[PDB]
Design a protein around this ligand. Structure first.
Ligand code: R7G
Length: 499
């Protein structure tokens, strides 16, 4: 008499609308008692054939395990294939009924959902993070064996298996599909190495979509590079560059010393700070109002504002909206990044902070920060699960500064010489481009939200090493935001505010 495991049914993972993302399917494991097999050698070759094993390698194996009462023959056949080889009636060949994950959306949601191992344990993504909730508790059954390992009776069930619990993700499979296709299309269109796209509900903290390129089929994980398994939206850190300028502007408008119509002189489009040189791409400007600084992405303009208000006020807004701060999702391998702090801020670091140099963030943090700005300065906690009861937000930017900065980002998108590729047919949209030279090689960024009049959705597009002549965020990333924001607002029945 021994006690042996009854595997629990692993909980269904669904999208927010109940569409299956991870399903436990019944499969059959074959095992053999070698001590029984050793009395039916004439049966081995037929049994070897049936397992697609070679006659002599199979016989070498049984011989080598002749002292044992258990070995695995094969794991995870269908119930039909399993029943096919049990029907050969080979002494000492036995059937365990098991569960195996199937992922109906495959590579589309692989980074978020993750996978289980052959033992049905969660090892990546949601499968790992919610493993206790999904696995349930195994059962035990009492099994009498004769003295040479022959299973005879099933004496009783000692303890019943408790099933796993259903888990509904925040992901909307319809937005996930749209996000997946358009990031793939832009990646191919730009000969890009990698990229990420994140969509947030600005009101609920919910991640409606999270896709990366490259991806992999979790149903077929054989001969698979690590690179394609990385959930880059959460585990990759990058410099966000000029996409942080709206947080600098937030500190400027909250200081009491700046309003949108104020002028900064950026001539000649450079500014020497000790040994270091601050440089604009476009160097044909003198006076720029604060909206112009964002439209022309003048590093010199935001630097002079940063000198006047102090890095401390800028650091604080960036810390508050979650840049380089723990998200608290508890997701495997999640990076925090780095928001550098100083006891006393020097000049050079005051400027670089203000335009997103020497800062490290995730696509998720950047999306969360834009979510807070869109939701009138209120940060709602992030969830990867369906939110039925929305937790209270924290007011991180005053509602009036948030509303002024939204208006300015609406201008970045809609005004003359603005980022017109980010415009969303039938809607007012708002956002900020960025371009990071990595240490030539570029990262193209667009972060924004829509509709501008009552924000619903925040979105970040990161394309890593576009290899065509176009590398600027406004060229590469902005058109992706456009197509994916259009489809997302329509799938979510958001009334057009620009008709
Ligand atoms: C923030 O991301 C800063 C500043 N960049 C500048 C900029 C940009 O210049 N985009 C617009 C470029 N540009 C046009 O597309 C365009 C089109 C027309 O029709 C006209 O007439 C003019 C122009 C025009 O000037 C960025 C943006 O995408 O918004 N932001 N980035 C940096 O400071 C760093 N990278 O600088 C560059 C990319 C110039 C470089 O090659 O080094 C940076 C920040 S963090 C990091 N690692 N690098």
């Amino acid at each position: 008499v021994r006690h042996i495991a009854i595997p629990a049914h692993r909980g269904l993972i669904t999208d927010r609308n109940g569409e299956p993302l991870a399903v436990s399917t019944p499969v059959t494991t074959l095992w053999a008692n070698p001590k029984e097999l050793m009395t039916a050698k004439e049966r081995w070759p037929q049994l070897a054939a049936a397992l697609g094993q070679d006659t002599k390698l199979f016989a070498d194996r049984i011989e080598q395990n002749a002292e044992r009462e258990f070995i695995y023959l094969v794991r995870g056949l269908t119930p039909e294939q399993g029943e096919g080889v049990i029907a050969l009636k080979v002494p000492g060949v036995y059937s365990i009924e098991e569960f195996r994950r199937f992922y109906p959306a495959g590579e589309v949601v692989a980074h978020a959902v993750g996978f289980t191992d052959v033992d049905d344990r969660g090892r990546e993504g949601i499968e790992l993070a919610f493993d206790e909730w999904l696995a349930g508790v195994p059962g035990k059954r009492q099994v009498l064996k004769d003295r040479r390992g022959r299973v005879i009776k099933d004496v009783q069930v000692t303890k019943n298996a408790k099933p796993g619990k259903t888990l509904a993700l925040s992901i909307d499979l319809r937005l996930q599909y749209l996000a997946h296709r358009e990031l793939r299309n832009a990646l191919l269109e730009n000969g890009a190495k990698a990229g990420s796209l994140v969509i947030m509900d600005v009101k609920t903290g919910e991640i409606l979509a999270m896709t990366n390129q490259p991806t992999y089929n979790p149903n077929n994980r054989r001969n698979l590079q690590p690179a394609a398994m990385r959930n880059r939206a959460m585990i990759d850190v990058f410099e966000p560059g000029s996409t942080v300028k709206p947080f600098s502007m937030s500190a400027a408008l909250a200081s009491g010393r700046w309003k949108p119509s104020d002028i900064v002189d950026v001539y000649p489009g450079t500014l020497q700070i000790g040994r270091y040189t601050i440089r604009d791409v476009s160097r044909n400007s003198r006076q720029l109002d604060l909206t112009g600084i964002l439209i022309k992405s003048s590093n010199v303009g935001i630097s002079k504002i940063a000198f006047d208000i102090g890095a401390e006020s800028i650091y604080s807004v960036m810390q508050q909206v979650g840049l380089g701060q723990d998200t608290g999702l508890g997701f495997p391998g999640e990076r925090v990044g780095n928001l550098p702090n100083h006891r006393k801020w020097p000049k050079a670091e005051t400027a670089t902070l203000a335009y997103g140099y020497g800062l490290s963030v995730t696509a998720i943090q950047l999306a969360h920060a834009y979510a807070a700005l869109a939701n009138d300065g209120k940060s709602v906690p992030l969830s990867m699960t369906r939110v039925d009861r929305v937790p209270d937000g924290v007011q991180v930017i005053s509602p009036e500064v948030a509303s002024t900065v939204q208006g300015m980002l609406q201008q970045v998108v809609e005004a003359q010489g603005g980022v017109f590729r980010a415009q969303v047919p039938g809607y007012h949209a708002a956002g900020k481009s960025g371009t990071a030279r990595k240490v030539n090689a570029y990262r193209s960024l667009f972060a924004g939200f829509a509709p501008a009049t009552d924000p619903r959705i925040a979105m970040v597009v990161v394309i890593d090493e576009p290899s065509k002549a176009g590398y600027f965020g406004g060229l590469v990333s902005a058109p992706v935001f456009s197509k994916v924001m259009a489809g997302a607002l329509r799938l979510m029945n958001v009334p057009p505010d620009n008709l």
